[PDB]
């Protein structure tokens, strides 16, 4: 469906103005007829974007109500009402058991539904942001007259007019223009104004001057044009549809959840029906056969687990909110940890998005300035008298000014009225020479010649601030070579000197080096005009050369670039140390893209492209073995004629990849290419041209300050302070939460065994029921909750940023090793500790373990109010039941006591508690509150009716203590083996 939109567009900028009118039945001068425009409206439809059909929240909520655990809990809830119905008909049961348990279980499903619904959130308003880029109104020429109309009423063929400050209402063929410049950052991510004129200037319509696009704005001048595309058919309207239309897809974390749901659901249905038939064979009435099944359901399903996961995710997202990293989708909290490839935009993401002075060439020396936002570098020069001469030209031969009321904000961050290069120079001098306004007050400008297309230079004449002179100084800047052809002397370390071929060659060298760094280079020179030849009232003519512009003194060079953000180089290296592959994907030109790649460490030192090898060896590129080149730089124009299989080979064959001059669909294609190889991919960006890629990414991260509204709609995560170091933190947090989820899951599952085994022995042994159904829910929904959550606050056991990204195909959240430990080893020890306390309670009340076998028949018989114990005493029905429920209560408390040790062992997968310590305060809180809850549930009056919880005698609490301790020792010995031999036996069997 969207495969059409993933392709590069076709256009009609090649046609003549006249020819273009024939195609759209239009007038170049009079414009369309009121009737013809209305006709075309009904024909083509409105100049608007329609949002894609969404899935209502209704269906979204209910889709969770049927996912493995909820299905089993539904079967339980209904099976409760089943047994209740069968009762209400047969023998009038005045009880509330099956009825209430059926109500409780149905509530558990609904509430669990809210948790998973909260986790599976999708806040997407892509198409809405795009719609915000179409103006409310447009100016059209109809019947030879200009009028404002609803922009939706704009059709292909009419004559539109735009001017500085307004949004392009539709894709236009420029037919007339006067000084028109446009901001195409929507399509390129670059905000430098692009001229628009009627002349065709490139085969590529996205590069030609005679096309203006919807989603962009006119920055200055005026233009008229013929509408060629409207609504969904515009270049960026298609990007809108592509972006808004892209299928979301399941996250890595989501896939893991479903996976263990299958496992646990599997064992649940297995043991469920495996013992349902095992009971009927033993001659159990279907009346009972279902009651046992309900218990089996409740025992096997970890009722509180899915909600635990959600809370652990939420708590991890809260910590990241506190580092200026907003998470829109709870699952995106983990994806960053599983990320193996980052596709990053350059401008406004890796870079500050601001022309900044990078180097200066004066005194036959290359000086480097500090490009960082917060200025974390050092000085270059202050002493040289040459510097002050260059500094003066940079301030004086400059027409840029700071906007009013910025004195509060830092120099480099403040808004400037002017072109990017003049702003850069302004901020450079203001920083290291103080107020520039002061320099422009001490040296009043009397005449100037602003930068001309033809002159290729800008000159200014000022009254020298010096009192002993107060004469006229000439300054000029422009193209380095043009400035050179106008110089005779060079200000070396203070004093001038003739411009010999020697210094002239050093100039060329300096010029070539700076240009090689991808930096824009300017020349600077001045000339102190002779006093006798220029009186204090001498008039200077700016129109006609009234003053010399030759034999001037060359002062120096200055170079500039849109520099990396301070934290970016280090963040890139850190991603790469964690084994994450970092690719650059930018709409910017290749020379600039490549230079920043080396600056931030995308391309490491020494690595070459095929073009680099060819130039170094002075040989044809076809003569170069492409396998000798680990780095590559792909232009979008070449990308366009490559198949995906060939794109896949590029991705496979290079470690250091730069995709430059890419369109928005091309970014999507590169992302998909990476994913196709089985990689989890993150995208980082800030422009509307990142929207499709951000949507398709497993996780999209947008910049918060510099980011466009669209990009932040398309993302899963926002960096609110533009701190790229947050990606590094995000991946670290993502890995940590993945491990801690394992700990929390194992902990929760472990207590399933002591809830399952009592029901089994109840059938096979014919003893009184050791633990009840209600009692199970008091564990999974009550006591285990806070402890399970607390594992989310566990510190790393080792340097997680030192390991490679997990293999999502092999490294699962819940594997066989977890089940073996939780179900086969620790849970089994917990089961016994439960049974022990059960036998203790009964034996101390007169029913010794031996006489318990095959007694349930008489025990449950409501009409036998005289059962004989081991000592020959006789018990009524309600009397023995009180002891039985007291058994449920102590078995319950036994679970809590054995979960104490389990909580401590689940703390660490490898390390010892004596190494990791007990610095998790939430965990300790869990221990205290868990025990408080259990005690309250046993001793609070009335709980014997609502939950069948009975007061325990002090000695009862200590039954499971020896089992709780064996768990601690056992797991500590086991992990001691793991560490002592990384070999594999204990490791490959039990290492979560």
């Amino acid at each position: 469906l969207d495969e059409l939109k993933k392709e590069v567009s076709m256009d009609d900028h090649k046609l003549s103005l006249d020819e273009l009118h024939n195609k759209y039945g239009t007038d170049l001068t009079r414009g369309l007829t009121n009737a013809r425009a209305k006709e075309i409206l009904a024909r083509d439809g409105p100049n608007s974007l329609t949002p894609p059909p969404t899935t209502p929240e209704w269906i979204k909520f209910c889709r969770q109500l049927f996912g493995g655990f909820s299905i089993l809990l539904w079967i339980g809830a209904i099976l409760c009402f089943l047994a209740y119905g069968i009762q209400a008909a047969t023998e009038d049961e005045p009880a509330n058991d099956n009825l209430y348990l059926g109500v409780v279980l149905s509530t558990v499903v609904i509430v669990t539904g809210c948790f998973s619904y909260y986790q599976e959130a999708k806040s997407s308003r892509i198409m809405d942001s795009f719609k915000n880029m179409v103006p409310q109104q447009a100016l059209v020429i109809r019947d030879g007259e200009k009028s404002t109309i609803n922009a939706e009423f704009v059709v292909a063929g009419d004559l539109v007019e735009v001017k500085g400050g307004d949004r392009i209402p539709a894709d236009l063929r420029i037919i007339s223009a006067h000084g028109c410049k446009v901001d195409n950052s929507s399509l390129t991510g670059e905000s430098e104004p692009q001229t628009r004129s009627p002349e065709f200037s490139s085969e590529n319509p996205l590069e030609t001057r005679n096309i203006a696009f919807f989603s962009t704005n006119c920055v200055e001048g005026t233009a008229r044009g013929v509408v060629v595309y409207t609504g969904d058919r515009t270049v960026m309207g298609r990007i809108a549809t592509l972006a808004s239309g892209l299928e979301v897809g399941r996250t890595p974390i989501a896939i893991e959840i479903e996976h263990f749901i299958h496992i646990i659901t599997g064992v649940a249905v297995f043991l469920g029906v495996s013992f349902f038939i095992l009971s009927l064979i033993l001659g159990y009435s279907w009346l009972e056969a279902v009651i046992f099944l309900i218990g089996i359901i409740v025992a096997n399903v970890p009722e509180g687990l899915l909600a635990t996961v959600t809370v652990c995710l939420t708590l991890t997202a809260k910590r990241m909110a506190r580092k200026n990293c907003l998470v829109k989708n709870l699952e995106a909290v983990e994806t960053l940890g599983s990320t193996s490839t980052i596709c990053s935009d350059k401008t406004g993401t890796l870079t500050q998005n601001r022309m900044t002075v990078a180097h200066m060439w004066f005194d036959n020396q290359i000086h480097e300035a500090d490009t960082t936002e917060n200025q974390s570098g050092a000085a270059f020069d202050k002493t040289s008298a040459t510097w002050s001469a260059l500094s003066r030209i940079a301030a004086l031969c400059n027409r840029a000014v700071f906007q009013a009321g910025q004195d509060n904000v830092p120099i480099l961050k403040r808004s400037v009225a002017g072109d990017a290069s003049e702003s850069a120079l302004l901020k450079c001098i203001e920083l290291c020479c103080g107020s520039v306004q002061g320099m422009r007050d001490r040296n009043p400008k009397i005449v100037e010649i602003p930068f001309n297309s033809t002159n290729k230079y800008q000159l200014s004449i000022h009254e020298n601030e010096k009192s002993s002179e107060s004469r006229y100084l000439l300054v000029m800047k422009g193209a380095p070579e043009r400035i050179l052809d106008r110089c005779s002397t060079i200000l070396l370390n203070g004093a001038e000197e003739p411009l010999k071929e020697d210094m002239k060659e050093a100039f060329q060298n300096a010029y070539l080096e700076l240009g090689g760094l991808g930096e824009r280079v300017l020349g600077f020179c001045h000339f102190a005009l002779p006093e006798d030849k220029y009186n204090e009232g001498y008039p200077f003519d700016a129109d006609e050369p009234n003053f010399p512009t030759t034999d001037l003194c060359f002062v120096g060079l200055m170079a500039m670039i849109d520099p990396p953000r301070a934290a970016v180089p280090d963040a890139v290296g850190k991603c790469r140390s964690a084994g994450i592959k970092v690719i650059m994907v930018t709409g910017d030109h290749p020379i600039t893209a490549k230079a920043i790649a080396k600056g931030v460490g995308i391309i490491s030192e020494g690595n070459e492209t095929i073009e680099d090898i060819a130039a170094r060896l002075n040989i044809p590129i076809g003569q170069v073995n492409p396998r000798d080149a680990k780095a590559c730089v792909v232009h979008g124009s070449d990308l366009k004629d490559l198949s995906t299989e060939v794109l896949d080979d590029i991705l496979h064959y290079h470690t250091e990849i730069v995709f430059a001059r890419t369109s928005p669909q091309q970014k999507l294609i590169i992302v998909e290419g990476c994913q196709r190889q089985g990689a989890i991919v993150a995208v980082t960006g800030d422009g509307v041209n990142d929207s499709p890629a951000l949507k398709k990414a497993d996780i999209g991260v947008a910049m918060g300050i510099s980011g466009s509204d669209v990009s932040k709609q398309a993302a899963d995560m926002i960096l609110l302070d533009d701190n790229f170091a947050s990606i590094v933190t995000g991946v670290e947090e993502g890995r940590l939460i993945f491990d801690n989820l394992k700990k929390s899951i194992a902990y929760t599952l472990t207590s399933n065994i002591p809830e399952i085994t009592p029901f089994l022995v109840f059938i096979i042994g014919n003893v009184p029921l050791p633990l009840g159904t209600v009692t199970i829910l008091c564990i999974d929904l009550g006591t285990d909750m806070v402890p399970a959550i607390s594992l989310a606050y566990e510190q790393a056991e080792s340097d997680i940023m030192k390991r490679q990204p997990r293999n999502p195909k092999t490294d699962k959240l819940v594997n066989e090793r977890l089940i073996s430990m939780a179900y086969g080893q620790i849970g089994m020890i917990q089961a016994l500790g439960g049974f022990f306390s059960y036998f203790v309670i009964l034996a101390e009340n007169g029913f010794l373990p031996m006489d318990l076998i095959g007694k349930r028949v008489r025990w449950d018989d409501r009409w036998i109010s005289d059962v004989e114990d081991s000592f020959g005493q006789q018990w009524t029905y309600e009397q023995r039941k009180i002891v039985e429920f007291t058994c449920h209560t102590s078995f319950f408390i036994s679970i809590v006591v054995v979960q104490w040790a389990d909580l401590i062992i689940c703390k660490t997968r490898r390390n010892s508690i004596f190494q990791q310590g007990m610095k998790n305060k939430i965990l300790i809180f869990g221990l205290f509150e868990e025990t408080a809850l259990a005690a309250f549930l046993s001793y609070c009056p009335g709980t014997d009716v609502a939950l069948r919880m009975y007061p325990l005698k002090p000695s009862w609490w200590f039954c499971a203590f020896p089992y709780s301790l064996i768990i601690f020792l056992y797991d500590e010995m086991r992990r001691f083996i793991i560490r002592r031999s990384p070999g594999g036996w204990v490791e490959q069997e039990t290492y979560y």
Binding site: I829, A843, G846, W863, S865, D866, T876, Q879
Partner: protein, 265 residues
């Protein structure tokens, strides 16, 4: 689903579960080692004695038809089961039985809950003390019973103040009374027991337990309802009175009966 590794994981879980079973058993050993053979550690959960009868009630109810044979043959099965134990052939010789007062007497202490003596000798009880009661084919002859509790001394109420069966045949010193009731007085209560009294003779106490007193016999109290009514559910409650006797709204068998007789004939 591994390789030959299936063996190594079998060798593990075999030894592992073996140890766990051996430990579980060990903790059961020590538990038993802390317990007496003659007396349970706790008795507060049987404390107030329950009162149970022979007619096995479907739901605290015994409804049947006099004009039908197999209508009551179900209740006669359980009635027989109990009384078959009070046979004279079961109580033979001076061991381990003893002839006790044919009239309600005081308690009898055979020492402590020790094995320092043989089987503590229990009082004989003749089912022949149960006058009038196949059993009552019309108007049932229910048999009451006080639940056995080791070392329990059932203490009758003293005639200090007012009483339900106000002072009639009040053998204050040696009888634990049992008065059945329904207002709703559409019946005819008739009690049979030891010495002809409507109670339990205190000479059968305290019970020394199964280990120290096997073949022991607890006193019975036969109750006959020769009601002149027919074809209606009659809620009859038999209540025992005493210092150590109490009741509960939950446990409807805590020192009392709940019988729903209906001679639907």
């Amino acid at each position: 689903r591994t390789g030959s590794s299936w063996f190594k994981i079998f060798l593990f879980y075999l030894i592992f579960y073996g140890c766990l079973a051996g430990i579980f058993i060990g903790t059961i050993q020590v538990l038993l080692l802390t317990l007496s053979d003659f007396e349970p550690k706790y008795q507060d959960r049987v404390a107030p004695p329950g009162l149970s009868h022979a007619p096995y009630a479907i739901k605290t109810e015994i409804s049947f038809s006099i004009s039908n044979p197999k209508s009551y043959e179900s209740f006669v099965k359980s009635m027989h089961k109990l009384m078959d134990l009070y046979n004279e052939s079961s109580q033979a010789g001076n061991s381990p039985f003893e002839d006790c007062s044919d009239t309600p007497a005081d308690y009898i202490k055979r020492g402590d809950l020790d094995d320092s003596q043989g089987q503590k000798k229990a009082c004989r009880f003749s089912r022949m003390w149960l006058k009038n009661c196949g059993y009552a084919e019309g108007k049932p002859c229910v048999v009451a019973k006080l639940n056995r509790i080791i070392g329990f001394y059932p203490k009758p109420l003293k005639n200090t103040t007012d009483l339900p069966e106000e002072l009639q045949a009040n053998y204050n010193q040696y009888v634990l009374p049992l008065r059945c009731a329904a207002r709703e007085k559409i019946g005819s209560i008739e009690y049979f027991g030891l010495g002809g009294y409507a109670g339990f003779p205190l000479q059968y106490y305290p019970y020394y337990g199964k280990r120290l007193q096997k073949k022991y016999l607890q006193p019975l109290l036969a109750i006959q309802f020769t009601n002149l009514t027919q074809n209606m559910e009659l809620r009859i409650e038999c209540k025992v009175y005493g210092e150590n006797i109490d009741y509960s709204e939950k446990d409807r068998f805590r020192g009392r009966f709940e019988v729903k007789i209906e001679v639907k004939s």
